[PDB]
Amino acid sequence: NYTEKFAAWSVICLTDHTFLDENGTEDDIRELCNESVKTCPFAAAVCVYPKFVKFINEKIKQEINPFKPKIACVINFPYGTDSMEKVLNDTEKALDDGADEIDLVINYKKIIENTDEGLKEATKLTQSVKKLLTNKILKVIIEVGELKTEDLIIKTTLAVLNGNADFIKTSTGKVQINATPSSVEYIIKAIKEYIKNNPEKNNKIGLKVSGGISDLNTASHYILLARRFLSDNFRIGSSSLVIKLRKVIS
């Protein structure tokens, strides 16, 4: 089944291979990084908590030289409720430790509870973080499974894009509802509106679909949505997908 193997190969190249079990150890991170480069197609990134960024940048880069997948670090994660000061301090430390990309949760609870103030706060936090991230990718997690409504998903997406987010990320994977085709469609609607109003940002904005993506067919579905309606510029976030896809290729 070469068609499936070809799709599987392409999808690994777009996947952020993820480990976000808070009680995890260097052993878990070593296994994650080895998996990301096991055989030929390498994952786009490894995605971890800030506490493990140094280990990857130092230890893993010493064991695997060169180590190609980018180091993506989550931030303000999963709850989105840290002060701007803490988020910025944590981000500076993560960058110091070797982080290449930042997957940042905004305060979606405040957007739900007190929308206008929450949207302004999300814009401001995203922008402040972006100032630390020249020529680095900032992905902003909007938590679509909590926002829920078309109106909040679109408004939140617009708010963070106006804060100069590079990517919109659907979900933390830490709440019950993750990406669905509908909420991805709403994000795409919002990005298109942002681009229309900011033409210089065309082909500069990415989408990362994360949470509950564990099979090739579903990964392909979302890629196709981005390709048809939206278009580096697309990622999958999964803790399991790469392992599955390597088996498909073998």
Side-chain angles (χ1 to χ4, degrees), residues 93-129:
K93 187 194 185 304
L95 291 166
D96 286 350
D97 291 353
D100 298 307
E101 305 181 351
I102 297 292
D103 288 26
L104 166 76
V105 186
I106 47 68
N107 196 353
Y108 66 90
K109 291 161 145 200
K110 191 150 162 66
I111 292 165
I112 291 161
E113 291 163 7
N114 184 358
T115 306
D116 296 298
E117 281 209 352
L119 295 169
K120 298 188 205 94
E121 185 177 309
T123 297
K124 191 168 297 290
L125 182 65
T126 300
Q127 183 61 264
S128 74
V129 179

PDB file of all heavy atoms in Angstrom, residues 93-129:
ATOM      1  N   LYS A  93      13.344  32.183  29.755  1.00  0.00           N
ATOM      2  CA  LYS A  93      14.092  31.022  30.230  1.00  0.00           C
ATOM      3  C   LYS A  93      14.102  29.876  29.202  1.00  0.00           C
ATOM      4  O   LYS A  93      15.154  29.294  28.919  1.00  0.00           O
ATOM      5  CB  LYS A  93      13.539  30.536  31.572  1.00  0.00           C
ATOM      6  CG  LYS A  93      14.379  29.426  32.216  1.00  0.00           C
ATOM      7  CD  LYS A  93      13.627  28.749  33.358  1.00  0.00           C
ATOM      8  CE  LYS A  93      14.499  27.718  34.082  1.00  0.00           C
ATOM      9  NZ  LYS A  93      15.086  26.651  33.212  1.00  0.00           N
ATOM     10  N   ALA A  94      12.925  29.549  28.660  1.00  0.00           N
ATOM     11  CA  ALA A  94      12.811  28.543  27.602  1.00  0.00           C
ATOM     12  C   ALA A  94      13.687  28.865  26.388  1.00  0.00           C
ATOM     13  O   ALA A  94      14.335  27.991  25.852  1.00  0.00           O
ATOM     14  CB  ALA A  94      11.329  28.356  27.182  1.00  0.00           C
ATOM     15  N   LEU A  95      13.716  30.121  25.968  1.00  0.00           N
ATOM     16  CA  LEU A  95      14.590  30.526  24.860  1.00  0.00           C
ATOM     17  C   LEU A  95      16.076  30.365  25.226  1.00  0.00           C
ATOM     18  O   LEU A  95      16.857  29.829  24.441  1.00  0.00           O
ATOM     19  CB  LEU A  95      14.293  31.954  24.440  1.00  0.00           C
ATOM     20  CG  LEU A  95      12.924  32.111  23.764  1.00  0.00           C
ATOM     21  CD1 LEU A  95      12.553  33.585  23.679  1.00  0.00           C
ATOM     22  CD2 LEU A  95      12.914  31.441  22.390  1.00  0.00           C
ATOM     23  N   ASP A  96      16.440  30.832  26.416  1.00  0.00           N
ATOM     24  CA  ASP A  96      17.782  30.612  26.972  1.00  0.00           C
ATOM     25  C   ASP A  96      18.172  29.132  26.949  1.00  0.00           C
ATOM     26  O   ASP A  96      19.320  28.800  26.641  1.00  0.00           O
ATOM     27  CB  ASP A  96      17.859  31.141  28.413  1.00  0.00           C
ATOM     28  CG  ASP A  96      17.913  32.664  28.488  1.00  0.00           C
ATOM     29  OD1 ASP A  96      18.088  33.323  27.434  1.00  0.00           O
ATOM     30  OD2 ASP A  96      17.793  33.203  29.615  1.00  0.00           O
ATOM     31  N   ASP A  97      17.217  28.247  27.253  1.00  0.00           N
ATOM     32  CA  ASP A  97      17.475  26.806  27.346  1.00  0.00           C
ATOM     33  C   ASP A  97      17.562  26.096  25.993  1.00  0.00           C
ATOM     34  O   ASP A  97      17.931  24.923  25.947  1.00  0.00           O
ATOM     35  CB  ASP A  97      16.411  26.089  28.207  1.00  0.00           C
ATOM     36  CG  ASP A  97      16.486  26.441  29.680  1.00  0.00           C
ATOM     37  OD1 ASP A  97      17.439  27.133  30.111  1.00  0.00           O
ATOM     38  OD2 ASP A  97      15.567  26.028  30.419  1.00  0.00           O
ATOM     39  N   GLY A  98      17.194  26.779  24.908  1.00  0.00           N
ATOM     40  CA  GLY A  98      17.281  26.196  23.571  1.00  0.00           C
ATOM     41  C   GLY A  98      15.990  26.036  22.767  1.00  0.00           C
ATOM     42  O   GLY A  98      15.990  25.402  21.709  1.00  0.00           O
ATOM     43  N   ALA A  99      14.894  26.625  23.231  1.00  0.00           N
ATOM     44  CA  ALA A  99      13.613  26.450  22.519  1.00  0.00           C
ATOM     45  C   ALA A  99      13.618  27.180  21.169  1.00  0.00           C
ATOM     46  O   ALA A  99      14.110  28.313  21.064  1.00  0.00           O
ATOM     47  CB  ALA A  99      12.469  26.924  23.381  1.00  0.00           C
ATOM     48  N   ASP A 100      13.060  26.522  20.155  1.00  0.00           N
ATOM     49  CA  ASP A 100      12.948  27.044  18.799  1.00  0.00           C
ATOM     50  C   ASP A 100      11.564  27.650  18.535  1.00  0.00           C
ATOM     51  O   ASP A 100      11.450  28.638  17.827  1.00  0.00           O
ATOM     52  CB  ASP A 100      13.204  25.931  17.782  1.00  0.00           C
ATOM     53  CG  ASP A 100      14.608  25.345  17.891  1.00  0.00           C
ATOM     54  OD1 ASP A 100      15.588  26.128  17.854  1.00  0.00           O
ATOM     55  OD2 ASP A 100      14.725  24.111  18.011  1.00  0.00           O
ATOM     56  N   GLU A 101      10.528  27.030  19.094  1.00  0.00           N
ATOM     57  CA  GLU A 101       9.136  27.441  18.877  1.00  0.00           C
ATOM     58  C   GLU A 101       8.419  27.462  20.209  1.00  0.00           C
ATOM     59  O   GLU A 101       8.782  26.718  21.126  1.00  0.00           O
ATOM     60  CB  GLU A 101       8.419  26.439  17.948  1.00  0.00           C
ATOM     61  CG  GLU A 101       9.124  26.207  16.623  1.00  0.00           C
ATOM     62  CD  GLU A 101       8.411  25.239  15.706  1.00  0.00           C
ATOM     63  OE1 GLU A 101       7.423  24.588  16.145  1.00  0.00           O
ATOM     64  OE2 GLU A 101       8.863  25.121  14.536  1.00  0.00           O
ATOM     65  N   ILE A 102       7.388  28.298  20.326  1.00  0.00           N
ATOM     66  CA  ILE A 102       6.639  28.418  21.568  1.00  0.00           C
ATOM     67  C   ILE A 102       5.162  28.152  21.238  1.00  0.00           C
ATOM     68  O   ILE A 102       4.614  28.769  20.313  1.00  0.00           O
ATOM     69  CB  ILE A 102       6.790  29.813  22.197  1.00  0.00           C
ATOM     70  CG1 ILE A 102       8.248  30.123  22.591  1.00  0.00           C
ATOM     71  CG2 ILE A 102       5.889  29.949  23.461  1.00  0.00           C
ATOM     72  CD1 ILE A 102       8.804  29.276  23.773  1.00  0.00           C
ATOM     73  N   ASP A 103       4.539  27.210  21.960  1.00  0.00           N
ATOM     74  CA  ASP A 103       3.101  26.963  21.807  1.00  0.00           C
ATOM     75  C   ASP A 103       2.402  27.527  23.048  1.00  0.00           C
ATOM     76  O   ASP A 103       2.419  26.916  24.138  1.00  0.00           O
ATOM     77  CB  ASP A 103       2.791  25.466  21.648  1.00  0.00           C
ATOM     78  CG  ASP A 103       3.216  24.905  20.299  1.00  0.00           C
ATOM     79  OD1 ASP A 103       4.151  25.437  19.659  1.00  0.00           O
ATOM     80  OD2 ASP A 103       2.590  23.906  19.870  1.00  0.00           O
ATOM     81  N   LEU A 104       1.819  28.709  22.874  1.00  0.00           N
ATOM     82  CA  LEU A 104       1.363  29.542  23.988  1.00  0.00           C
ATOM     83  C   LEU A 104      -0.153  29.474  24.188  1.00  0.00           C
ATOM     84  O   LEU A 104      -0.912  29.743  23.267  1.00  0.00           O
ATOM     85  CB  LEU A 104       1.779  31.004  23.755  1.00  0.00           C
ATOM     86  CG  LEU A 104       1.104  32.071  24.637  1.00  0.00           C
ATOM     87  CD1 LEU A 104       1.674  32.112  26.073  1.00  0.00           C
ATOM     88  CD2 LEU A 104       1.218  33.444  23.967  1.00  0.00           C
ATOM     89  N   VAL A 105      -0.586  29.145  25.397  1.00  0.00           N
ATOM     90  CA  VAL A 105      -2.023  29.203  25.711  1.00  0.00           C
ATOM     91  C   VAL A 105      -2.388  30.621  26.124  1.00  0.00           C
ATOM     92  O   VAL A 105      -1.714  31.220  26.972  1.00  0.00           O
ATOM     93  CB  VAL A 105      -2.436  28.207  26.822  1.00  0.00           C
ATOM     94  CG1 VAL A 105      -3.969  28.216  27.005  1.00  0.00           C
ATOM     95  CG2 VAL A 105      -1.971  26.786  26.470  1.00  0.00           C
ATOM     96  N   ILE A 106      -3.448  31.164  25.514  1.00  0.00           N
ATOM     97  CA  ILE A 106      -3.993  32.437  25.967  1.00  0.00           C
ATOM     98  C   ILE A 106      -5.094  32.234  27.030  1.00  0.00           C
ATOM     99  O   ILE A 106      -5.552  31.108  27.264  1.00  0.00           O
ATOM    100  CB  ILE A 106      -4.465  33.341  24.789  1.00  0.00           C
ATOM    101  CG1 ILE A 106      -5.313  32.580  23.761  1.00  0.00           C
ATOM    102  CG2 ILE A 106      -3.246  33.967  24.110  1.00  0.00           C
ATOM    103  CD1 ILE A 106      -6.687  32.115  24.263  1.00  0.00           C
ATOM    104  N   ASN A 107      -5.522  33.319  27.658  1.00  0.00           N
ATOM    105  CA  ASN A 107      -6.525  33.230  28.716  1.00  0.00           C
ATOM    106  C   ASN A 107      -7.932  33.091  28.132  1.00  0.00           C
ATOM    107  O   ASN A 107      -8.742  34.062  28.111  1.00  0.00           O
ATOM    108  CB  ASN A 107      -6.387  34.413  29.692  1.00  0.00           C
ATOM    109  CG  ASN A 107      -7.123  34.202  31.018  1.00  0.00           C
ATOM    110  OD1 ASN A 107      -7.869  33.233  31.211  1.00  0.00           O
ATOM    111  ND2 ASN A 107      -6.909  35.135  31.951  1.00  0.00           N
ATOM    112  N   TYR A 108      -8.228  31.874  27.659  1.00  0.00           N
ATOM    113  CA  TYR A 108      -9.530  31.611  27.038  1.00  0.00           C
ATOM    114  C   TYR A 108     -10.671  31.658  28.057  1.00  0.00           C
ATOM    115  O   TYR A 108     -11.806  31.950  27.686  1.00  0.00           O
ATOM    116  CB  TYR A 108      -9.534  30.264  26.282  1.00  0.00           C
ATOM    117  CG  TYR A 108      -9.371  29.068  27.198  1.00  0.00           C
ATOM    118  CD1 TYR A 108     -10.486  28.437  27.760  1.00  0.00           C
ATOM    119  CD2 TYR A 108      -8.111  28.569  27.510  1.00  0.00           C
ATOM    120  CE1 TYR A 108     -10.351  27.354  28.604  1.00  0.00           C
ATOM    121  CE2 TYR A 108      -7.968  27.484  28.366  1.00  0.00           C
ATOM    122  CZ  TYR A 108      -9.092  26.876  28.904  1.00  0.00           C
ATOM    123  OH  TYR A 108      -8.956  25.791  29.750  1.00  0.00           O
ATOM    124  N   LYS A 109     -10.383  31.352  29.327  1.00  0.00           N
ATOM    125  CA  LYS A 109     -11.415  31.446  30.380  1.00  0.00           C
ATOM    126  C   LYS A 109     -11.913  32.883  30.531  1.00  0.00           C
ATOM    127  O   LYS A 109     -13.118  33.122  30.634  1.00  0.00           O
ATOM    128  CB  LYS A 109     -10.910  30.918  31.726  1.00  0.00           C
ATOM    129  CG  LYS A 109     -10.682  29.408  31.782  1.00  0.00           C
ATOM    130  CD  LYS A 109      -9.753  29.088  32.959  1.00  0.00           C
ATOM    131  CE  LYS A 109     -10.084  27.770  33.628  1.00  0.00           C
ATOM    132  NZ  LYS A 109      -9.514  27.739  35.006  1.00  0.00           N
ATOM    133  N   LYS A 110     -10.993  33.845  30.514  1.00  0.00           N
ATOM    134  CA  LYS A 110     -11.387  35.250  30.581  1.00  0.00           C
ATOM    135  C   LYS A 110     -12.191  35.672  29.346  1.00  0.00           C
ATOM    136  O   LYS A 110     -13.131  36.451  29.463  1.00  0.00           O
ATOM    137  CB  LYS A 110     -10.166  36.162  30.796  1.00  0.00           C
ATOM    138  CG  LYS A 110     -10.518  37.609  31.146  1.00  0.00           C
ATOM    139  CD  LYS A 110      -9.457  38.249  32.028  1.00  0.00           C
ATOM    140  CE  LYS A 110      -9.552  39.773  32.030  1.00  0.00           C
ATOM    141  NZ  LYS A 110     -10.803  40.333  32.655  1.00  0.00           N
ATOM    142  N   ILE A 111     -11.833  35.155  28.169  1.00  0.00           N
ATOM    143  CA  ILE A 111     -12.596  35.430  26.941  1.00  0.00           C
ATOM    144  C   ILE A 111     -14.036  34.915  27.065  1.00  0.00           C
ATOM    145  O   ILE A 111     -14.977  35.570  26.623  1.00  0.00           O
ATOM    146  CB  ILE A 111     -11.895  34.836  25.682  1.00  0.00           C
ATOM    147  CG1 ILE A 111     -10.580  35.578  25.408  1.00  0.00           C
ATOM    148  CG2 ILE A 111     -12.819  34.867  24.454  1.00  0.00           C
ATOM    149  CD1 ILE A 111      -9.634  34.848  24.433  1.00  0.00           C
ATOM    150  N   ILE A 112     -14.202  33.752  27.685  1.00  0.00           N
ATOM    151  CA  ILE A 112     -15.527  33.158  27.866  1.00  0.00           C
ATOM    152  C   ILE A 112     -16.334  33.977  28.878  1.00  0.00           C
ATOM    153  O   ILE A 112     -17.497  34.307  28.624  1.00  0.00           O
ATOM    154  CB  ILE A 112     -15.429  31.659  28.302  1.00  0.00           C
ATOM    155  CG1 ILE A 112     -14.895  30.797  27.155  1.00  0.00           C
ATOM    156  CG2 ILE A 112     -16.794  31.106  28.759  1.00  0.00           C
ATOM    157  CD1 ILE A 112     -14.338  29.435  27.629  1.00  0.00           C
ATOM    158  N   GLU A 113     -15.698  34.325  29.994  1.00  0.00           N
ATOM    159  CA  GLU A 113     -16.355  34.998  31.120  1.00  0.00           C
ATOM    160  C   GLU A 113     -16.582  36.484  30.876  1.00  0.00           C
ATOM    161  O   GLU A 113     -17.635  37.014  31.217  1.00  0.00           O
ATOM    162  CB  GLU A 113     -15.554  34.801  32.418  1.00  0.00           C
ATOM    163  CG  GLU A 113     -15.576  33.361  32.951  1.00  0.00           C
ATOM    164  CD  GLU A 113     -14.478  33.075  33.971  1.00  0.00           C
ATOM    165  OE1 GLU A 113     -13.761  34.020  34.381  1.00  0.00           O
ATOM    166  OE2 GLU A 113     -14.327  31.894  34.364  1.00  0.00           O
ATOM    167  N   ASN A 114     -15.599  37.146  30.279  1.00  0.00           N
ATOM    168  CA  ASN A 114     -15.637  38.594  30.089  1.00  0.00           C
ATOM    169  C   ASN A 114     -14.964  38.936  28.770  1.00  0.00           C
ATOM    170  O   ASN A 114     -13.786  39.307  28.737  1.00  0.00           O
ATOM    171  CB  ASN A 114     -14.941  39.283  31.267  1.00  0.00           C
ATOM    172  CG  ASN A 114     -15.025  40.794  31.202  1.00  0.00           C
ATOM    173  OD1 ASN A 114     -15.582  41.374  30.262  1.00  0.00           O
ATOM    174  ND2 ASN A 114     -14.462  41.446  32.209  1.00  0.00           N
ATOM    175  N   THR A 115     -15.737  38.824  27.693  1.00  0.00           N
ATOM    176  CA  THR A 115     -15.191  38.690  26.346  1.00  0.00           C
ATOM    177  C   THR A 115     -14.324  39.846  25.850  1.00  0.00           C
ATOM    178  O   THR A 115     -13.212  39.621  25.390  1.00  0.00           O
ATOM    179  CB  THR A 115     -16.296  38.358  25.336  1.00  0.00           C
ATOM    180  OG1 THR A 115     -16.996  37.198  25.789  1.00  0.00           O
ATOM    181  CG2 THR A 115     -15.711  38.071  23.963  1.00  0.00           C
ATOM    182  N   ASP A 116     -14.836  41.069  25.930  1.00  0.00           N
ATOM    183  CA  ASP A 116     -14.101  42.213  25.401  1.00  0.00           C
ATOM    184  C   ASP A 116     -12.744  42.386  26.089  1.00  0.00           C
ATOM    185  O   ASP A 116     -11.730  42.490  25.409  1.00  0.00           O
ATOM    186  CB  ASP A 116     -14.958  43.481  25.455  1.00  0.00           C
ATOM    187  CG  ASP A 116     -16.184  43.382  24.562  1.00  0.00           C
ATOM    188  OD1 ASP A 116     -16.021  43.248  23.327  1.00  0.00           O
ATOM    189  OD2 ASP A 116     -17.314  43.423  25.091  1.00  0.00           O
ATOM    190  N   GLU A 117     -12.725  42.381  27.421  1.00  0.00           N
ATOM    191  CA  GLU A 117     -11.474  42.431  28.180  1.00  0.00           C
ATOM    192  C   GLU A 117     -10.569  41.232  27.891  1.00  0.00           C
ATOM    193  O   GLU A 117      -9.349  41.387  27.783  1.00  0.00           O
ATOM    194  CB  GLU A 117     -11.740  42.498  29.683  1.00  0.00           C
ATOM    195  CG  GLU A 117     -12.124  43.884  30.201  1.00  0.00           C
ATOM    196  CD  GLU A 117     -11.697  44.108  31.648  1.00  0.00           C
ATOM    197  OE1 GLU A 117     -11.242  43.141  32.311  1.00  0.00           O
ATOM    198  OE2 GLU A 117     -11.809  45.261  32.117  1.00  0.00           O
ATOM    199  N   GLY A 118     -11.170  40.046  27.778  1.00  0.00           N
ATOM    200  CA  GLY A 118     -10.414  38.816  27.465  1.00  0.00           C
ATOM    201  C   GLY A 118      -9.747  38.862  26.102  1.00  0.00           C
ATOM    202  O   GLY A 118      -8.602  38.414  25.943  1.00  0.00           O
ATOM    203  N   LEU A 119     -10.453  39.399  25.106  1.00  0.00           N
ATOM    204  CA  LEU A 119      -9.875  39.510  23.770  1.00  0.00           C
ATOM    205  C   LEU A 119      -8.704  40.482  23.754  1.00  0.00           C
ATOM    206  O   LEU A 119      -7.657  40.178  23.189  1.00  0.00           O
ATOM    207  CB  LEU A 119     -10.922  39.887  22.715  1.00  0.00           C
ATOM    208  CG  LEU A 119     -12.017  38.841  22.462  1.00  0.00           C
ATOM    209  CD1 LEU A 119     -13.133  39.443  21.616  1.00  0.00           C
ATOM    210  CD2 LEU A 119     -11.447  37.578  21.804  1.00  0.00           C
ATOM    211  N   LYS A 120      -8.872  41.649  24.376  1.00  0.00           N
ATOM    212  CA  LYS A 120      -7.768  42.608  24.464  1.00  0.00           C
ATOM    213  C   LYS A 120      -6.539  42.019  25.177  1.00  0.00           C
ATOM    214  O   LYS A 120      -5.402  42.193  24.713  1.00  0.00           O
ATOM    215  CB  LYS A 120      -8.228  43.896  25.148  1.00  0.00           C
ATOM    216  CG  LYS A 120      -9.334  44.627  24.382  1.00  0.00           C
ATOM    217  CD  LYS A 120      -9.604  45.995  25.001  1.00  0.00           C
ATOM    218  CE  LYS A 120     -11.015  46.489  24.705  1.00  0.00           C
ATOM    219  NZ  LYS A 120     -11.962  46.120  25.806  1.00  0.00           N
ATOM    220  N   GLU A 121      -6.780  41.306  26.277  1.00  0.00           N
ATOM    221  CA  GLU A 121      -5.718  40.644  27.046  1.00  0.00           C
ATOM    222  C   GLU A 121      -4.967  39.614  26.197  1.00  0.00           C
ATOM    223  O   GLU A 121      -3.726  39.586  26.192  1.00  0.00           O
ATOM    224  CB  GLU A 121      -6.294  39.996  28.316  1.00  0.00           C
ATOM    225  CG  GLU A 121      -5.247  39.384  29.264  1.00  0.00           C
ATOM    226  CD  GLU A 121      -5.868  38.822  30.544  1.00  0.00           C
ATOM    227  OE1 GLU A 121      -6.642  39.552  31.201  1.00  0.00           O
ATOM    228  OE2 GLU A 121      -5.569  37.661  30.904  1.00  0.00           O
ATOM    229  N   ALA A 122      -5.710  38.775  25.471  1.00  0.00           N
ATOM    230  CA  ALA A 122      -5.094  37.807  24.535  1.00  0.00           C
ATOM    231  C   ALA A 122      -4.208  38.478  23.476  1.00  0.00           C
ATOM    232  O   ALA A 122      -3.107  38.005  23.180  1.00  0.00           O
ATOM    233  CB  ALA A 122      -6.178  36.936  23.855  1.00  0.00           C
ATOM    234  N   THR A 123      -4.695  39.569  22.887  1.00  0.00           N
ATOM    235  CA  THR A 123      -3.896  40.341  21.925  1.00  0.00           C
ATOM    236  C   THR A 123      -2.586  40.825  22.552  1.00  0.00           C
ATOM    237  O   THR A 123      -1.502  40.686  21.960  1.00  0.00           O
ATOM    238  CB  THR A 123      -4.704  41.538  21.343  1.00  0.00           C
ATOM    239  OG1 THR A 123      -5.832  41.043  20.609  1.00  0.00           O
ATOM    240  CG2 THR A 123      -3.843  42.400  20.426  1.00  0.00           C
ATOM    241  N   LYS A 124      -2.700  41.385  23.756  1.00  0.00           N
ATOM    242  CA  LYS A 124      -1.564  41.975  24.468  1.00  0.00           C
ATOM    243  C   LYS A 124      -0.528  40.933  24.891  1.00  0.00           C
ATOM    244  O   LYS A 124       0.673  41.160  24.761  1.00  0.00           O
ATOM    245  CB  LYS A 124      -2.073  42.738  25.690  1.00  0.00           C
ATOM    246  CG  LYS A 124      -1.035  43.627  26.367  1.00  0.00           C
ATOM    247  CD  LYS A 124      -1.688  44.573  27.385  1.00  0.00           C
ATOM    248  CE  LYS A 124      -2.674  45.557  26.724  1.00  0.00           C
ATOM    249  NZ  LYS A 124      -1.989  46.577  25.879  1.00  0.00           N
ATOM    250  N   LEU A 125      -0.997  39.796  25.410  1.00  0.00           N
ATOM    251  CA  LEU A 125      -0.101  38.704  25.813  1.00  0.00           C
ATOM    252  C   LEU A 125       0.654  38.127  24.615  1.00  0.00           C
ATOM    253  O   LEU A 125       1.879  37.972  24.667  1.00  0.00           O
ATOM    254  CB  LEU A 125      -0.878  37.596  26.551  1.00  0.00           C
ATOM    255  CG  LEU A 125      -0.048  36.408  27.076  1.00  0.00           C
ATOM    256  CD1 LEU A 125       0.922  36.862  28.166  1.00  0.00           C
ATOM    257  CD2 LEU A 125      -0.961  35.280  27.599  1.00  0.00           C
ATOM    258  N   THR A 126      -0.081  37.799  23.552  1.00  0.00           N
ATOM    259  CA  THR A 126       0.499  37.307  22.303  1.00  0.00           C
ATOM    260  C   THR A 126       1.576  38.281  21.795  1.00  0.00           C
ATOM    261  O   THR A 126       2.694  37.859  21.485  1.00  0.00           O
ATOM    262  CB  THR A 126      -0.583  37.090  21.225  1.00  0.00           C
ATOM    263  OG1 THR A 126      -1.555  36.132  21.689  1.00  0.00           O
ATOM    264  CG2 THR A 126       0.018  36.601  19.929  1.00  0.00           C
ATOM    265  N   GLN A 127       1.259  39.576  21.746  1.00  0.00           N
ATOM    266  CA  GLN A 127       2.239  40.551  21.244  1.00  0.00           C
ATOM    267  C   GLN A 127       3.497  40.626  22.115  1.00  0.00           C
ATOM    268  O   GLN A 127       4.614  40.659  21.590  1.00  0.00           O
ATOM    269  CB  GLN A 127       1.628  41.940  21.045  1.00  0.00           C
ATOM    270  CG  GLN A 127       2.615  42.956  20.455  1.00  0.00           C
ATOM    271  CD  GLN A 127       3.116  42.550  19.067  1.00  0.00           C
ATOM    272  OE1 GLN A 127       4.193  41.952  18.923  1.00  0.00           O
ATOM    273  NE2 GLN A 127       2.324  42.847  18.051  1.00  0.00           N
ATOM    274  N   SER A 128       3.317  40.630  23.433  1.00  0.00           N
ATOM    275  CA  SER A 128       4.447  40.714  24.360  1.00  0.00           C
ATOM    276  C   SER A 128       5.374  39.504  24.201  1.00  0.00           C
ATOM    277  O   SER A 128       6.601  39.649  24.171  1.00  0.00           O
ATOM    278  CB  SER A 128       3.961  40.872  25.800  1.00  0.00           C
ATOM    279  OG  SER A 128       3.427  39.647  26.293  1.00  0.00           O
ATOM    280  N   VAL A 129       4.781  38.315  24.075  1.00  0.00           N
ATOM    281  CA  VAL A 129       5.544  37.090  23.822  1.00  0.00           C
ATOM    282  C   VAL A 129       6.252  37.147  22.470  1.00  0.00           C
ATOM    283  O   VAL A 129       7.432  36.794  22.373  1.00  0.00           O
ATOM    284  CB  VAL A 129       4.667  35.798  23.959  1.00  0.00           C
ATOM    285  CG1 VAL A 129       5.507  34.536  23.651  1.00  0.00           C
ATOM    286  CG2 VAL A 129       4.122  35.690  25.376  1.00  0.00           C
TER     287      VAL A 129
END
